Structure formats: C-alpha cells, structure tokens
Symmetry: D2
Subunit: 292 residues, 4 copies
C-alpha cells in the first residue's frame, strides 16, 4: 500500500514519444518479481509535465491493467489549479488505484492557506487516499509541517512524499500528525536517513533500476537493521546521485534502456537525450551497484 520501496516509474516511450506497452509491461513484471511495494504512475519521474490529462489517464489505466492486481498502483494527480486537480482525480475514482500522489501547486506560489484550501477541496471530491507531495525546488512552494498537520486532520489525507532533502522535516511532521500518517522520502540520496528518523519508505527513482536492492534496503530499515541497510545504500549512492546528473528522468530512462528493461530511452521536450558524458557517468554508477 504505502510503506517500503515505492517506485516512481518511468513512462517508457517509443521513438515517437508515446507510451510503449511492451516496455511498461516488462517494468511492471520486474517490480512484481523484485519485491517493490507499490508503483507511482505518472509522478515526476513518469513525465507528468509533458503528458496531457488524456495521455496521463491512459498510462495510469494501462499500468493498472498490467499490474493485474499483483502490485498496488498510486496515480499522480497533482495540478496547479484546484479545479484541474479535482478533474484529474475524478478520472481515477473507482479505477482500481489505491490512492493519489498530489503535488503542491507549481508556478503560482500559493500561500499556506492556499495549499490548505487546495488539498482540502481535492480530498473532498474523492474517496481515494491522498499522499501530499512537497518538492520546493520544482514548484517554488514549500508545504510546511504546520500546514501538513492541518491537512492530516482531513480523513483521506493519509501521508506525505517529502522531497526537500531536509531531514528535520521528518520529526516536525511526525509530532503534528497521527501515528498512522505515512512519511515517505522523495529524495533517494537521503531516504535511508529519512527512514532512520521515523519515515516509512521512499518513492524512488533509483528503484527503477535497482528494485531488488531498494526493496531489501527498505525491509532492513523497517526492521531496525540500519547498518545492514547502509551497506546496500552505499552500493546505490552513486545511482542516487548520478541519476540526477542531467534532469530526471533523462538518466534513469537511459539506464533502463541500458539494462534492457525498456526498448527506447525517448523523452518528451523540453527533456532532451542524455549527453555522452552523462551516459559514462550513469554507466559507472550502474557498475558500482553491480548491475552491469
């Protein structure tokens, strides 16, 4: 459901830029075989910015179909207009997804009162569980712990993906919310630290290409075996870093292609193909993790 290693899955494309079903099926089978806890479909790593809402919905529904009940699917449903976020969420009502990952409005820089009204309105128009998502480097907006506390009082707001990389947020949030509100890292390089402080898992880029290792790390964390988890983390740290050598998901798509998990590493503009220097860097990180 909402703990352990959750992959922010790539939306694999053909050379034309449209979803590649055979690739998507190969990835999903991989995540089932690897012990991934859930799949986030059409999150940031899934190129939500460059799919239209129809295309987005098609990918989510295809992912659900291919998952075939073997692995839970959380849909990306964020938007920077509240009405649009409500419309997008309503597309998934009764779909089979287990909840929604909803990013703070980007670009328009709402106030904290605005963020409260936005997420409350979205939560009120669905029965689906809502995971807030804070990623200020992308959005220009920072959903602060006090406001997460206020929102956690809404019945179906049940967790947060905290992608600041600021580990002080874990216990600031935890003290204002109930014991069952889920804290998930959105920052691979700090995620083991985030779990060590009390978080419950990660929505991960790295899990796209090191799914088994990520699942093993997160299990060890949950069991309180941090030193064993950290050995895995150290083997993965160059991926955690170098999968952002160029803008995500440029590196992870390349890595997926290199590993034979997807047919092509195509992305949509303004994301551009990986540079030669980038390929060499990512290749080295994959080798360090023992994947190549």
């Amino acid at each position: 459901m909402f703990t352990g290693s959750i992959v922010a899955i790539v939306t694999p494309m053909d050379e034309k830029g449209n979803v590649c079903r055979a690739s998507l099926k190969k990835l999903i089978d991989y995540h089932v075989a690897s012990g991934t806890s859930a799949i986030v479909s059409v999150g940031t790593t899934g190129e939500f910015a460059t799919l239209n809402h129809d295309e987005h919905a098609d990918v989510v529904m295809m992912t659900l179909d291919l998952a075939d009940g073997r692995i839970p699917v959380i849909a990306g449903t964020g938007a920077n207009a509240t009405a649009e976020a409500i419309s997008l969420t309503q597309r998934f009502n009764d779909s089979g997804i287990v909840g929604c990952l909803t990013v703070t409005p980007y670009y328009n820089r709402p106030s904290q009162e605005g963020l409260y009204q936005h997420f409350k309105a979205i939560a009120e128009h669905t029965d689906l569980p809502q995971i807030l998502y804070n990623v200020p480097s992308r959005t220009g907006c920072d959903l602060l712990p006090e406001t997460v506390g206020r929102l956690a009082k809404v019945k179906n707001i049940i967790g947060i993906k905290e992608a600041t990389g600021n580990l002080t947020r874990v216990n600031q949030i935890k003290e204002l919310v109930s014991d069952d509100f889920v804290l998930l890292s959105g920052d691979d390089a700090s995620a083991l630290d985030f779990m060590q402080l009390g978080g419950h898992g990660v929505i991960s880029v790295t899990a796209n290409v090191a799914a088994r290792d990520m699942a093993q790390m997160c299990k060890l964390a949950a069991e309180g075996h941090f030193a064993e988890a950290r050995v895995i983390n150290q083997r993965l740290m160059p991926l955690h870093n170098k999968l952002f050598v160029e803008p995500n998901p440029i590196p992870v798509k390349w890595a997926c292609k290199e590993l034979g998990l997807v047919a092509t590493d195509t992305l949509r503009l303004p994301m551009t193909p990986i540079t030669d220097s980038g390929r060499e860097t990512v290749r080295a990180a994959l080798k360090h993790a023992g994947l190549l």
Copy 2:
C-alpha cells in the same frame, strides 16, 4: 510596442471566477488613457496557471476586441511541454496580437540545451515575435545569459522579460545579443535600476493601478533622466513591494477593486482572498503612491 511601461494585466473575474468583460473594458480604457505601451494578456499576473487553454484564448481575444487597435496586446503563451507551447501559439496566429510572452518550462527543470530546443521549436512554428520569460523563483529553472545569446540568433526571438531581480543579468545579456534585442524587467521593485543599466522597459504589476506614473517613469528612464524617474519610483516603491505581500495577483486585484477599476477581487484557487492585514498594507501603499 516592446519598450516602456507594459502592464501584466489582471484577468478580472466575477464571483464565479469567470472573466468579467465589463471590468476588463474599464481596465483597457484606463491603459489607453494613461499611456501604457502594451498589455500582456494572461501573463503570470493574469492567472495563466488557472485558466484552461480555451478560457486563456478567450481572454486574449476579448482583450484584443476591447483594445480595438488602440493599444498593442502581447499574449502569454508559455507551457512546460514544448508541444503544448507550440499548440497554444497556433491559436493566436493571425489573432491581432503583436507578440508572445513565453515562460521557461516550470516544474520539470530542463537543462540549458532543453531550454534552447524548447524555445527554438516554438519560434520555428510561428511568425509572431517571441519574448522569452525567466522567473526562476516560480519555475525552478534559470535561463542563463549564454542560452539567451544562442536564442537571440533566432530571427523572431526578439527579447526577454528578466524577472530574477538580479541586475547583473542586464549587461551579461546585452553583451551577447544585438542592439535591437529588447530587455524588459519582470521585477517592479528593481525595474528602474534595470532600465538604468540598459533595459528598455518593464512588464509590470504596479502599472495595473499606477499606469500614468509608470508610463512617465519609463519615459524619463529611456531619455536618461534617472534622477527624475527615481522620484516617481520612490513614491511607487511601497506598491512595488506590497503588491507581493501575499501571492500575486491577490493584492493587485484587491487594489483594482478598491480603486473601482474592477467589479470584484475574485481569483481562482489555489489563490485565496486577501487577509485583513494585507488589505491594510496594500491600502497604505496606494495612499503613498497618491492613488486614494
């Protein structure tokens, strides 16, 4: 017209959040009478974030119809997907707009090369003049002078709205582009300084309520009369700051309502109504500028 005081006009709304034609007419007449150089329709201040593409186009067309040839209109046309920006651009071909204001992709944080490809593609598919728009605090990415220099070689990329507030950008860009490339400030509080360093004008929030003083300030600046311009700037500085006391365009829409230029101060979520403390701050700034 791409120099002088250009207003980033509000999109006035009724209580339902729908565009108020009567209020828009009043603003347009105000700008014609007050000597504003041009109107930026559905820029940031015009709530491009929360209008859909149809409503956005309607507002641009309504603005053109109401302007009736008396003042030039520039349309906001940016998007974070290069295909969507191209699509939106096509809607305005032969509309009567003089140019497009096209923001760097927000949220997805493309590389410089990605920005280059993005804007180059948009420019290729129109004959309309394009004004690049850099606002890193909103978008998460920063279109750097070197890339602006590469883009300025494209025939119909004709200027930039630089909203960093980092004044060193003026001459870094100027030295890389031709003498006819327009530099426009997107930061009211530093705009006179921007013009003093070589900028050609401003795309302004303050101009929505102080159009005549903005128009004269920019003229004096273009003539080299900076001391004279600075007297006006000092009277407007509280507005340049306090129009951002809560997220733009919340304060300026309230100010327009207080002056009687628009029927209601309604905005779309996630923007919310001005706080009482914000009304007090904004009113004080209006009085400092001599407007109430």
Copy 3:
C-alpha cells in the same frame, strides 16, 4: 569526555564586561549537579570573538580550577590564522583540559586544502585531542565530509562539532571515519535527530539553562530510547529556537540571569542587551520548559 550533553558555557560577566568568578563557579556547580558531560569553555556561546587571547586563557584556566576535576573541560582554540591557532592551543598544553574545540577559519574562506593544512598543522603542535568545528553561517566556510575524512586520519583529530543543521552530514561523515570518531551536534533544535542518525551527543546552548533535561535527553538517546527523549525535546524546543531570537549568547545570558545562575547578563559589543520583546519571548520558552 566527548559524548552526551556538553554545555557551550556562557562566559558570565560583571557590568564592566569582565569575567565574573562567582557566577562562573555557580554555573560549573550547576553542571556538576545536573549531569552535564563536559564543558566547552570560550566557544562561540562563551564569546570567543570578543575576548583577547589572554582573557580567553584566563577564563579557561579559571573554569578548570573551579571544575576541580569534577567535570571535563574542553577549550575553544579556533583562529582564522593557522599560526595564531597554534599559539592559542600551546597555551593549554599540559593545562588539564581534555581537548580543544577548533573552528574552521572564519572570514578568509580557505579552500578544502587550506582547511586540511590548517587543522593538520594545529594537530601536529599538540598532544591534545582536537574536535573540528563547522559552522558555515558564521564563518563563510564549509568543512565538507571528504575533508573531515582526510583529517580523521591524523591521530589526535578525534571528532567534529557539526553545526550546519544539515542532518545528511551525520552518515556522510560516519562512513569516512573510524567507529571511534565522535560526532557532535552544534545545532540544538536538530540535535536529537542528529543523535538518532548516529551522532554521539551535542555541544549545546540550551544545556546552559536546562542542563538536567539535556543530560536526561542525551542519556535516553544513547540508550536508544528516542520516543522518551523526544518528549523532553518537545518541552525544550521553544528554548532551542528562541535562545536564537536575538544573536547568541544574548538570549541565553538573559535566561541565565533570570534563573539566578549568573549575576548580570552583560556582554561585549557588538553584542547588545536583549530587547524587551526578546525578554518576553525567552521568558515564554523558559515557562514552557517548566523552568520558571
């Protein structure tokens, strides 16, 4: 020695700005009675910036004398010139202090190679244990984990006071150093989190006025009792924050006076007396902690 709750003790002054022996003795007796693990004398909170090296040495020696073997004393010995740091350290050779707290050079912004040469030269001119101290908001310099690793190879460099508040540093450093290199927080508000990640204690401002609570928190942490430690932390969090409402040690000196621990709250310029608003804020925090 170098774990648990270490107080960065204030240098109490008379009204003239010189050390007050009776106050210093009262504080030291308090730390012995409270279970404080060690005292840092003439660190940042002890006003190292505004004591001359003679005055500094006198305070350290007086603190040692008053401690009377009951509680270990670590001297502040940092300087931004290597020669000066060596001279200051040599004053304490054979003094009775148990080690030195040596801040990265401030103002001059050395490179990482510079930081390496600086601390290596200092370590080579003493037999005393050296605790590095990184506080970039004050110094303009950031001693990065790689360089801490390089330095940890020097026999008598035995730990670090990490005052960035960036909790990712704990495990970055730990993986590059031996199991016996000591990690101490220099940031009260994050210090329980820092210990939860693997750190060994804190050099604390808050311990000046909540010494018993800080010692109890740190003991619980070391025992792996984080939830119990966090209850104490929550009671102390307003002090952890509000003891920096005005520049440290302005608030903590006031609080020490209010509690009857020191005779006067005098400081040296450019530190100035606490403002009325500050007194009210600090008073509230003391009340929250159950100290007043």
Copy 4:
C-alpha cells in the same frame, strides 16, 4: 581620495611570510604611475586575517612611507570586537592615512542595532573618515541600507564599500544618505554596473594587475561614458571572475609574481599555493586583458 579606482593592495611576502618592502615599493610605484586613486592597505586582499595588529600596523606605515605623499592610503581597521576596532584605529591616528576601511564584525553575527553601536563607537573615537565595509559572504552578517542610513548621520562615517554584488543596494542606500556619502563597489565583476547605477568607484582586486585600465574605466564611468567603460570591463571580466578561482588573494598574488611586480607569491596559512589548474585559468585571464 575616496572615488575612482582604489586598489585593495596585496601584502607581498617573502618565502617566510614576512612583508617584502622591495616588492611593496614596486607596487606602490606602479599605482602612482598608473593613475590609481588610492591604496587600501591591509584590506581583505591584503590578508588582514593573518597579520597580527603589529604586523598590520607595520605594513600600513611602510605603505605610507613608500607612498611618500604621492597617493592616498586608507587603512583596513575592522575587527569583530568593538574594543579591538577602537584600539586598532588609535594606532593610525596622525599616521598620514586619509581614512579607515572598517568591516562589519565577522563570525559573531551581531544585530543591526549591534552594528549601529559598533560603528558609532569607532567613529566617535577618531577624527579619521570611516568607510563601512559590508561583505556578508565572509562575515555572516549583512549591514542593511536602513542601518547604513542611520550611520551616515555620524559626521565621520563618509561612505561604504558594498561587496554583496547585489546591485539593488546602490539606490537603496543612496536614497537614505546625503549626496556626499561615497558608495564604492567591493565586487570587481559587478563594479561597472555599480557605478552605472550611481556608485562612485571601486575597491578592487583586479586593479592590482590592471591598474591603468581600471583607472580609465572608472573615469569613463564617472563621466557617464558607460559604453566606453564597458569595452574595458569586457577585456577585464575574465580577471574579475578568475581572480576568485581559488580564494583571494591566492590568484592575484600569483598574477603579480607572473608579471614581475612582486618577488614571491607566498601567503599565510590557511591560504595555500595556487593549483596548476588555477595558474592556467589566471594566466588565460591575464592574456585576455592584454597583460602578458
């Protein structure tokens, strides 16, 4: 003289780190011949951080003796303890210096009120003109325009060396001070922009090796001939940047050695010798400026 191109002169050292009188003479003659306005002796670039007060005074006196009335000398006199700044100031009373350059307290992060008291006290105890010096990247504190305005009312506080590189400060300060208060840039790369906005000159690192071009650039700027000045600035921009490729004054001392102006490029720890890559970068910048 407190306008035009003022050099923040290196303190040339022999291999032992002691001041080289022969090298200093050569530099002083160079500045007299090249039209430099004044010499700042034992500023940041002069390694004020690593000279003791006696050595600092010796260098100022030697500079005065060598200048022999041919060029005005301003002494660096700042400290982070108000008493120490006063003490140092007294050493220079009736020395022959024309003024003092006094940096905001570093490391201890005083309040604005603390800065006000600090500088007010220093000014009270001398008849020498005082130039305030703001460099937040080094000091950890930021002397804001409002406080500069309060200090400019003190009769002998006569200007400011503003080294933020934040160009909005020019007119924020100008509007709060009298027409005769001097604004000087402390950031070579933005200094021409600073002058274009109303600044009166620069306290420069670049001037150590490009004194004549700096002197002419500043004259053209003072005359309003900004286009002409900017041609010179463009030839000097690689030096303005690459003199900071490693910590200042490491690169400029190497540059002075390469040109033959000083016998050795030796500095005091924690400054270290220039890297090979830095020598290559600096040399390239020298050639761009036409100096080798």
